[PDB]
Design a protein around this ligand. Sequence first.
Ligand SMILES: Cc1cn([C@H]2C[C@H](O)[C@@H](CNC(=S)Nc3ccc(Cl)c(C(F)(F)F)c3)O2)c(=O)[nH]c1=O
Length: 200
Amino acid sequence: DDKKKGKFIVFEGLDRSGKSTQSKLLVEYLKNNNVEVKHLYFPNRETGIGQIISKYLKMENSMSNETIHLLFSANRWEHMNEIKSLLLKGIWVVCDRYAYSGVAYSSGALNLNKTWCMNPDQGLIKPDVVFYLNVPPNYEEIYEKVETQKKIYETYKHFAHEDYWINIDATRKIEDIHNDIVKEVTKIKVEPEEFNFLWS
Ligand SMILES: Cc1cn([C@H]2C[C@H](O)[C@@H](CNC(=S)Nc3ccc(Cl)c(C(F)(F)F)c3)O2)c(=O)[nH]c1=O
């Protein structure tokens, strides 16, 4: 009746870490293996909430640090019913960015308290695995600056030792990064299981 049957994979990483390259490669690989999979992205800029987030990111409005933080969290909550329904049926979800982005970006770029940042996402569906595309920032949107990216790299380390968190050296060839990811995916437990939730 109520078991999670599909698998839920999140990609995390700084901007231009290769997330969408790798997530598209993973989705293609799963589809070639007959697995039904939905590719989702956060923020979803299409929703009423996402359209405001979009203005914020393009600097078409300005918003206070707590206001935008909470909108990013509400934007995930408005997808929970749909993600749950997919996973309950056995459809997999590959998702570019999630609650980890919310915490790392707001604490890193906006200097918000980590616990305060985590609280609104408590209760979101927990993914089976997070692939963190690790690219030290050594080299249009509000967080674009290399100075801003360096602060976020540090804050992402908050999650580095959780057993769901898989560090991926994203400085390697694209094919080799993808092979690395496919390998970890084959380790995911096959059978249905109870849903788990952040930040358990
Ligand atoms: C899910 C989520 C995302 N973000 C930020 C992360 C990222 O800095 C920003 C960028 N998002 C998207 S969809 N695209 C994007 C495209 C180009 C460029 Cl240059 C950038 C950025 F400015 F970040 F570099 C971002 O959205 C957040 O700040 N909090 C969140 O919870």
